[PDB]
Amino acid sequence: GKLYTLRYEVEGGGFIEIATVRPETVFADQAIAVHPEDERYRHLLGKRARIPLTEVWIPILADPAVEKDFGTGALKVTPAHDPLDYEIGERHGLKPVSVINLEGRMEGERVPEALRGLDRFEARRKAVELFREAGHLVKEEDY
């Protein structure tokens, strides 16, 4: 129902914005991918971004499959939860990390305490509020 834009802290200061309709999967991110020719992010290639609400840092890498006009043009990559991300993960040797188990519940050290054990849909709603309260929610748009 909604598109969320989140700001992830960038190594050395500043932020990089990512858009997603699956905020609960942010904790499984393994990279942020950008098109190599995208002027907005080229200088960030090789630096790292911190996953909101965690102490996990992931690579900002380049991949030609990224569409500069989709979202912010910076794509969070979660190989375990999306088939397109899985293909990017294979090209870059990313390790799939799942934060949603087979029963549909959130699980994992990377998942914030308040979200563990919740079913995916309830976690999606709560994750948005945790991001909002922590200062990571840049914007929310309705479909």
CATH of domain 1-143: 3.90.740.10
- Of how many residues is the chain composed? 143
Task: For 49, list phi and psi in degrees, rounded to 5.
Answer: -120, 145
Technique employed here was X-ray
Q: In terms of DSSP bridges, do strands 137-142 and 15-20 run parallel, antiparallel, or are they unpaired?
A: unpaired
Residue type, 48: R
142, two tokens: 């309705």
Q: Can you tell me the distance from the alpha carbon of 42 to that of 36, in angstroms, rounded to the nearest whole number?
A: 6
Residue 29 forms beta bridges with which residues? none
With CA atoms as reference, report the closest residue to 44 among 14, 20, 18: 14
Query: Do the beta carbons of residue 62 and residue 74 sit within 8 Å?
Result: no
**C-alpha 104 chain-centroid distance:** 19
SS3 64: coil
62-96 burial: b if 16+ Cβ within 10 Å, else e: bbeebebeebbbbbbbbbbbbeebeebbeeeebee
- CA distances in angstroms from 56 to 28, 37, 64, 67, 71, listed in the order given: 10, 27, 25, 25, 23
Are 99 and 106 in contact by the 8 Å Cβ rule? The answer is yes
**Which among 36, 37, 29, 35 is positioned nearest to 6, based on CA atoms?**
29
Measured in angstroms, the resolution is 1.7
The 3-state DSSP class for residue 138 equals strand
